């Protein structure tokens, strides 16, 4: 219902999402705040890379879980 995504800057951002939501949806909700395009976003929950088209209930991210946002800034 509510989760914690911890970014590159050490700052944490909290978000409101159902466990039935996409990852795509989550990246979109993050883009709603920071404006970081879901393109340049990639998410990691407990050592697991996160797939754009899966759910949260898929990866066992529960309420009050902390996942990381690594930017893949389009390189070179």
């Amino acid at each position: 219902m509510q989760i914690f995504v911890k970014t590159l800057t050490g700052k944490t951002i909290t978000l409101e999402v159902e466990p039935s939501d996409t990852i795509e949806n989550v990246k979109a909700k993050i883009q709603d705040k920071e404006g970081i395009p879901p393109d340049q976003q990639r998410l990691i929950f407990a050592g697991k890379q996160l797939e754009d088209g899966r759910t949260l209930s898929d990866y066992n991210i529960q309420k009050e879980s902390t996942l990381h946002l690594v930017l893949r800034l389009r390189g070179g």
């Binding site: 911890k6 590159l8 800057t9 990691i44 050592g47 996160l50 066992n60 690594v70």
Partner: protein, 399 residues
Amino acid sequence: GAMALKRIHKELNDLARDPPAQCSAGPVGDDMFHWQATIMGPNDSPYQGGVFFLTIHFPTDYPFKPPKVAFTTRIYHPNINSNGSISLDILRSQWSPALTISKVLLSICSLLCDPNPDDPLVPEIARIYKTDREKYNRIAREWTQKYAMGGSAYDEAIMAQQDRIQQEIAVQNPLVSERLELSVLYKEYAEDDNIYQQKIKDLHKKYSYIRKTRPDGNSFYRAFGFSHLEALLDDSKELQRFKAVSAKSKEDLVSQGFTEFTIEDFHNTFMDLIEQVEKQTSVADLLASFNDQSTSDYLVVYLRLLTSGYLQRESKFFEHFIEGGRTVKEFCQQEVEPMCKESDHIHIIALAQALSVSIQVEYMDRGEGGTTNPHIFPEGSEPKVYLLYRPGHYDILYK
């Protein structure tokens, strides 16, 4: 002299146990007295988003003297001269032998959020701070967005992120854990996830045990390695038949274009790991060898190179299977050869055919029934090695 280097290790352990996300440091390769620290601009400050490197040199006698610390990145602050040195006086007058570097750079991170206009290194920046703020902020923002924010630099920070992650991921998880009954899985999941508990009931159906691997991005290769290596602890004909293909694989790859001297390293780790199978070691001895960071990782590297090798070999078999517009080799260099890069279906089939062996992969995600789908690769070959796919992660199962 000796006590100095002896102490720097203690401080590195202190900085190790607790990662300070924004402010963190470390030595440069060989050198203990040369350190380098990445510092992210704290949010709600004009410096946010930019990355500021700084170099550290310890005195020959630590800690009776303060470490010399200076920004290698240009920055606009009243207390940091454009020549790079910092005005913080715990590094000069007020230094104590009781202070860790942690104190220092966490005091610097504090110097960024809140500047110190009364004791200026550069009087003009101090003057601007105390009078016209918008000027100060804007200036600091372009000094960020040219010098700090520019390009390459970011990578190191984003690399640090990774390091900060899979080290603590390694604090919870070991490389290869013990052999535990799979009844533990019930505890991992929720009470609102019934569907998963049904998948797991249906898992207790087939397999009596599980062994878990660290989610480092190598999950598949690590699991494959341990499972198949302990699988040859029984079948001798297969152990020999396997050993031979291994020995062939080296020059097979070198004749496929891989430089020999570099891949020899990894080869010998593979072959020694086989060697403690050949001479039979109790499974836990092998596990101990596998929970060795370098031995394990060296293995994983080789397995990746082997998938790459078979992929290059078969390129027409594959190339139109490749998701996107890459080649087979482009896909190798991007998605297979490098460490900690995710493994997919193509990877597993490639490695399986490469070593000419059978594997069974148990898929469980959201599937409506209690159905956990077995996958035997390649088809029909009765697998003596069993793995579990949870989404994004691989582990191993035991009948």
